[PDB]
Amino acid sequence: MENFQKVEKIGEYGVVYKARNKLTGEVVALKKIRLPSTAIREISLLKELNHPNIVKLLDVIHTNKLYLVFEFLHQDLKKFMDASALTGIPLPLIKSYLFQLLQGLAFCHSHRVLHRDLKPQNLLINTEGAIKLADFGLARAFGVPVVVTLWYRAPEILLGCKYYSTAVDIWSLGCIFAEMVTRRALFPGDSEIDQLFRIFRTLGTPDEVVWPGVTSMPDYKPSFPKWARQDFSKVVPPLDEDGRSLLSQMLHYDPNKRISAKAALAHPFFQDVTKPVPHLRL
Ligand SMILES: O=C(O)c1cc(C(F)(F)F)ccc1NCCc1c[nH]c2ccccc12
């Protein structure tokens, strides 16, 4: 604030505004977070850690409040999916978007940085056909003393695992992939247990056979109902076997069997990937 002309509120960690630097004229995304050396330092390292599929962090300012200045993009995937709901996003664009998000995840995962909260609304898109990871859920992990959507949460998170791996981002991205294809949210739960049971009713209640150690998870209960796995061809029906195969590997219960971002990039689904340009109304 005061160094910036607030153009518009663009979302609610805190509130984010489209703002214009009063001197340079740069239009940016200003994230205001209401509230440590490691936190400030570790966040500040991200300014020089850049990738084309990751939102650029331009500046960090801390005074009771933490301000993060990001590059600005006009639209996100949630808006674009709503706009495309009658026709669906064309498969070459779905494929390009999935490819780029896996590139961004492979990058930050190779730097031991997890996103933890991937959702369509956090995925920024531009007129050039790019998509970028934004709104990283990094405050808790960096140690920042700061209704939540659970639809994209990995099952190990919902079952109380305290140590997330990179696999929780692959799960979320798998859910988003399915949603681009079918134009319906895959697992739209409204409570942690409702989220978990929606997952169980589709993929089957997990057990020690498919997920060793599942019955030892902190929030696992032997009284969980035992649902059979559904025919996976019901899940994303129109999608071809290349896409379905990739999706099933992204939705493995066992985080140790869930495909990595780098390995997913080599999957045969991406052999004909291109970079179409979307039809964006701004
Ligand atoms: O996205 C946010 O809101 C956000 C919030 C916080 C916190 F809440 F802790 F303050 C910290 C970082 C954030 N983004 C980083 C974006 C980024 C830039 N370069 C990267 C390289 C690898 C991985 C991520 C990045």
Side-chain angles (χ1 to χ4, degrees), residues 13 31 33 43 46-47 49-50 54-57 66 68 70 107-108 113 134-136 138-139 142 144:
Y13 284 170
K31 197 174 293 203
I33 303 165
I43 292 155
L46 307 181
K47 312 199 319 188
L49 206 52
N50 296 287
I54 300 185
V55 62
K56 181 168 191 4
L57 172 65
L66 178 67
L68 303 177
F70 291 99
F107 174 84
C108 66
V113 178
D135 304 326
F136 280 69
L138 282 166
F142 281 169
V144 173

Side-chain angles (χ1 to χ4, degrees), residues 195-241:
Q195 186 68 35
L196 209 50
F197 286 3
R198 282 178 186 268
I199 300 173
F200 293 1
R201 287 198 297 270
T202 300
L203 309 178
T205 298
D207 53 32
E208 295 290 331
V209 168
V210 302
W211 189 358
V214 71
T215 60
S216 301
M217 293 284 292
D219 301 331
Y220 179 84
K221 313 290 171 189
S223 54
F224 282 168
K226 285 181 175 57
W227 286 283
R229 177 168 188 99
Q230 283 307 109
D231 199 327
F232 198 83
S233 67
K234 291 168 68 70
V235 180
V236 284
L239 195 60
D240 60 67
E241 173 62 18

Side-chain angles (χ1 to χ4, degrees), residues 7 17-18 46 48 61 85 93 123 128 131 136-137 150 192 198 248 260 264 278:
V7 175
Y17 305 92
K18 175 170 185 192
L46 307 181
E48 307 184 346
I61 321 270
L93 192 49
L123 301 182
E128 308 273 282
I131 184 163
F136 280 69
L150 306 177
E192 287 196 36
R198 282 178 186 268
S248 75
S260 76

